[PDB]
Amino acid sequence: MKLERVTVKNFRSHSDTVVEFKEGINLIIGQNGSGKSSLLDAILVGLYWPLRIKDIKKDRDTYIDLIFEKDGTKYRITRRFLKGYSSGEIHAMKRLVGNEWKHVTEPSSKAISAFMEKLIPYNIFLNAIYIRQGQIDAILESDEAREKVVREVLNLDKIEKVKKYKALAREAALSKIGELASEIFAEFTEGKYSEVVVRAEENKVRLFVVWEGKERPLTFLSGGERIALGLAFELAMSLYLAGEISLLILDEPTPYLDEERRRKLITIMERYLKKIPQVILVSHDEELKDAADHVIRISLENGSSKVEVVS
């Protein structure tokens, strides 16, 4: 999957917003209330309507047009929500054939929904592509938090034989995650650590890194290495779910004003995240510009969201 362009009209603070996404790392900066979160929401709506997101339906017309790429085919979803009661809706999903857009299914919400559910399943997008806020932190918070995260992201599972079976399934899953995360984390730490261990004990998912043939908790790592581990873990889950990493959306994976980790993040961005076909990074940090391939600033001007390409 690869986002090309999103157009949003009359959705919250977006009166007339057009955002072009390019290859590599797309950095989105701006303040809280500028319109970036609502832009992500607009994208979600564009892709997976009907779903529960306020300020879309009627209760000026709301217009969302999304152009994206999937397995060598340009898709365009156009949605228009009419407000007035008269309160109709107009939906279309088209494919680019030469230079003409041609419908791929009935111009209906249900048909387009059914179609999208097959093209790119909603769970795949939410769990593998879209990394929402607090996730990477939750991975690093504690074993219980980690357990919650992995349970939610990978489905998993919360008469003793059945318990043993469940434990076995969980074990297999977490072991695979361990392998994937080991590889990615090895890629990240420049070869310093080559093995990551993920294990379940009761209501807790232990996470360790192997150093000199001994499992050690994340405590014995630097902040950068911890963030690297969290990212590697998330990416491992993404690979586990999707079988590949094409698009990755990172909505504020970092904290507020903590440069001690920003460096490692910049390193990771420059040296590893640029390998990914496309990355959307939504941050408040102005210091990431140089590490991105494309920078987009979203601000609030005259009460409306303004988009400007930085440099």
From Swiss-Prot:
It holds the Pfam family AAA_23. Changing residue 231 to W: Destabilizes the ATP-dimerized state. Promotes HerA/NurA activity. PROSITE patterns: ZN_HOOK (PS51131). Changing residue 226 to G: Decreases ATP-induced dimerization. Increases DNA end tethering. InterPro entries: ATPase_AAA_core, P-loop_NTPase, Rad50/SbcC_AAA, Rad50_ATPase_archaeal, Zn_hook_RAD50. ATP binds at residues 12, 32-38, 133, 192-193, 220-225. Belongs to the SMC family. RAD50 subfamily. Binding of ATP induces a closed, compact conformation of the Rad50/Mre11 complex. ATP hydrolysis opens the complex. The two conserved Cys that bind zinc constitute the zinc-hook, which separates the large intramolecular coiled coil regions. The 2 Cys residues coordinate one molecule of zinc with the help of the 2 Cys residues of the zinc-hook of another Rad50 molecule, thereby forming a V-shaped homodimer. Part of the Rad50/Mre11 complex, which is involved in the early steps of DNA double-strand break (DSB) repair. The complex may facilitate opening of the processed DNA ends to aid in the recruitment of HerA and NurA. Rad50 controls the balance between DNA end bridging and DNA resection via ATP-dependent structural rearrangements of the Rad50/Mre11 complex. The ATP-bound conformation promotes DNA end binding and end tethering, and alters Mre11 nuclease activity. ATP hydrolysis promotes both Mre11 activity as well as HerA/NurA activity. Also has reversible adenylate kinase activity. Homodimer. Forms a heterotetramer composed of two Mre11 subunits and two Rad50 subunits. Homodimerization is promoted by ATP binding. This is DNA double-strand break repair Rad50 ATPase. The lineage of its organism: Archaea, Methanobacteriati, Methanobacteriota, Thermococci, Thermococcales. The gene is rad50.
